[PDB]
Design a protein around this nucleic acid. Sequence first.
DNA 1: GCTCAAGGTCACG
DNA 2: CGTGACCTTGAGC
Length: 90
Amino acid sequence: AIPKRLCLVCGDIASGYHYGVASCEACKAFFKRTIQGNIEYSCPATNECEITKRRRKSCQACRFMKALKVGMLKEGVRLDRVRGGRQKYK
DNA sequence: GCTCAAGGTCACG
DNA sequence: CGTGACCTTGAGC
Ligand SMILES: [Zn+2]
Ligand SMILES: [Zn+2]
């Protein structure tokens, strides 16, 4: 069996594992753009923000913080960028 | 020689 | 212009 996998970033049903933890497609795409595009962000407020589906739209910075914290590793994103190279961390 | 998930690719709000 | 989400790639079992 497996649990109903959940994007533990924003708290919605994950499509599956993406970057070695359960994460939805939006979080995947963001996490890529941030790293691959070397995009800098800042919190509107204080970068002391809980992250939900709603709150992540507001705070890109806090989204990226949550992502790293829970276990979407920066190094998970290959700069080599080759599809299907599964990265369940071990 | 199938199965899982990196991750493009591009359509919608 | 930022997600949202669905097809393709292509590495592991
Ligand atoms: Zn998510
Ligand atoms: Zn914030």
